[PDB]
């Protein structure tokens, strides 16, 4: 277990080892956070979220 194999590289969603090392990204409607790991919803109903409201 190295990069993306170790806890998905700490990424929220998509993980890629671009020329060694982890590179996280997000699905449409999400914007990668400042830490370059977390994914932030762009609106009221981001994909893949069970509707709480």
Experimental method: X-ray
Residues forming beta bridges with residue 39, ordered by sequence position: 32
Dmax over CA atoms of the chain, in Å, equals 41
Task: Mention the CATH class of domain 1-53.
Answer: mainly beta
Q: What count of other Cβ atoms lies within 10 Å of the Cβ of residue 39?
A: 19
Buried b (16+ CB within 10 A) or exposed e, 11-29: bbebbeeeeeebbbebeee
Among 39, 46, 47, 45, which Cα is nearest to 8's? 39
Q: For residues 53 and 43, what is the distance between their CA atoms, to the nearest angstrom?
A: 13
Final resolution, Å: 2.2
Boundaries of every domain in the chain: 1-53
């Amino acid at each position: 277990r190295k990069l993306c194999s170790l806890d998905n590289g700490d990424c929220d969603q998509f993980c890629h080892e671009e020329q060694n090392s982890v590179v996280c990204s997000c699905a449409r409607g999400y914007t990668l956070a400042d830490n370059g790991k977390a994914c932030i919803p762009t609106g009221p109903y981001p994909c893949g979220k069970q509707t709480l409201e």
